């Protein structure tokens, strides 16, 4: 089980990033995948996750307040990619960004941020003044 | 008049990047605005244009299918999407503006007059 | 010829970070090496640099206005690495380090810009507010 | 009385950070100041502390195994400000570290923390 992060890097305000997130053998399709991100000093916080429920039906997609408008998260099942579009970059947005997944293949909006388990090396993501 | 280029860095190749040139006082809507890049050691070569009956847009064969310009004519800002960065597209960005007359003439590279100051793209292996 | 940069990462400021870059084959104990830097959108600048004087009689190490007091640079002939302690980091040492080294000595002219051919691939050094 | 601590981040293994406690009123200097560090899932435990011995005639550092020879403690009595340089950082040293006071159930005052993260 891994997951390599890309598509980071330096930006200006207001520039755009796009990040990927390949996944080696688990079967991508039925898990519930997520970004995270940690500030210098800081906690680790949830950004965005997208995932299934059987209990509705369908996908269930997330964003916090402050990525709110501006992040897209989107899958590939076919390529077993996640990405992360990063439009409009402000400089609180400045973290090391992970690549998460959660593995009991049903949660959808009582995904708790405990249910991540599976984990990625990261990608530093850094927006200047 | 100024010109001001934001939104360049630096990213690995594969990468995405957007820039954005905002415009301060001279009709916007009425010019032909058009991106540069110099490369080190090269000289200053065009990128795509778009503006001026009906619009044109034109892009580099090197930018084919991976750039996008755009214009906002109401905040007076031109974009530049670039997708898929390459270790080729590293440069120093720059954003021109010509006038268009004619009508039947074209918008040759000589005919941007007014330029910025720049922003650096780096596109690392 | 491979030079390899670590030791980077995220700090909030007045913290402090430890830069270290190792040598492929090239015969370091001969080459002035030096710290490179770019922030996103600006032109590539030089840091702090050491090595060969002018005069085949002396070492001399270069440290640049911004960094002055601050960063300290220093070479292991023995080991083949090169050293940047950055103390007391401001938000505006955010940049890619690069780690370069030049080979032209010309008795009686000194170190250039220019004259730095092999590179690295960098490391990212993110000051936070 | 307020402890605020800086100087945290991300690291890659064998990196190295710095963190920074300025201390608000007053004690400083007759006071034992400390470094704790907890992680994740995991109780506090203490890291080292420097100050005062029994009887005045001198001061006491400590530094626990898991950090000795690669961390260093050091105070700034005029500044109010307690240091900690951490040099050769490993990943079990991700924690966050808190920033504490006495004068290790004798530690009373105590700051909120700084995140340090060292990944493979």
């Known amino acids: 089980?891994?997951?390599?992060?890309?598509?980071?890097?330096?930006?200006?305000?207001?520039?755009?990033?796009?990040?990927?997130?390949?996944?080696?053998?688990?079967?991508?399709?039925?898990?519930?995948?997520?970004?995270?991100?940690?500030?210098?000093?800081?906690?680790?916080?949830?950004?965005?996750?997208?995932?299934?429920?059987?209990?509705?039906?369908?996908?269930?997609?997330?964003?916090?307040?402050?990525?709110?408008?501006?992040?897209?998260?989107?899958?590939?099942?076919?390529?077993?990619?996640?990405?992360?579009?990063?439009?409009?970059?402000?400089?609180?947005?400045?973290?090391?960004?992970?690549?998460?997944?959660?593995?009991?293949?049903?949660?959808?909006?009582?995904?708790?941020?405990?249910?991540?388990?599976?984990?990625?090396?990261?990608?530093?993501?850094?927006?200047?003044? | 008049?100024?010109?001001?280029?934001?939104?360049?860095?630096?990213?690995?190749?594969?990468?995405?990047?957007?820039?954005?040139?905002?415009?301060?006082?001279?009709?916007?809507?009425?010019?032909?605005?058009?991106?540069?890049?110099?490369?080190?050691?090269?000289?200053?070569?065009?990128?795509?244009?778009?503006?001026?009956?009906?619009?044109?847009?034109?892009?580099?064969?090197?930018?084919?299918?991976?750039?996008?310009?755009?214009?906002?004519?109401?905040?007076?800002?031109?974009?530049?999407?670039?997708?898929?960065?390459?270790?080729?597209?590293?440069?120093?960005?720059?954003?021109?503006?010509?006038?268009?007359?004619?009508?039947?003439?074209?918008?040759?590279?000589?005919?941007?007059?007014?330029?910025?100051?720049?922003?650096?793209?780096?596109?690392?292996? | 010829?491979?030079?390899?940069?670590?030791?980077?990462?995220?700090?909030?400021?007045?913290?402090?970070?430890?830069?270290?870059?190792?040598?492929?084959?090239?015969?370091?104990?001969?080459?002035?090496?030096?710290?490179?830097?770019?922030?996103?959108?600006?032109?590539?600048?030089?840091?702090?640099?050491?090595?060969?004087?002018?005069?085949?009689?002396?070492?001399?190490?270069?440290?640049?206005?911004?960094?002055?007091?601050?960063?300290?640079?220093?070479?292991?002939?023995?080991?083949?690495?090169?050293?940047?302690?950055?103390?007391?980091?401001?938000?505006?040492?955010?940049?890619?380090?690069?780690?370069?080294?030049?080979?032209?000595?010309?008795?009686?002219?000194?170190?250039?810009?220019?004259?730095?051919?092999?590179?690295?691939?960098?490391?990212?050094?993110?000051?936070?507010? | 009385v307020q402890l605020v601590e800086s100087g945290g981040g991300l690291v890659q293994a064998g990196g190295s950070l710095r963190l920074s406690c300025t201390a608000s009123g007053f004690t400083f200097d007759d006071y034992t100041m400390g470094w704790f560090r907890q992680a994740p899932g995991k109780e506090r435990e203490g890291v080292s502390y420097?100050?005062?011995?029994?009887?005045?005639?001198?001061?006491?550092?400590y530094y626990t195994d898991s950090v000795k020879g690669r961390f260093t403690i050091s105070r700034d009595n005029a500044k109010n400000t307690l240091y900690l340089q951490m040099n050769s950082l490993k990943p079990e040293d991700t924690a966050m570290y808190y920033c504490?006071?006495?004068?290790?159930?004798?530690?009373?005052?105590w700051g909120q923390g700084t995140q340090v993260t060292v990944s493979s």
């Open positions: 504490a006071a006495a004068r290790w159930t004798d530690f009373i005052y």
């Open positions: 420097t100050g005062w011995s029994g009887s005045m005639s001198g001061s006491t550092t």
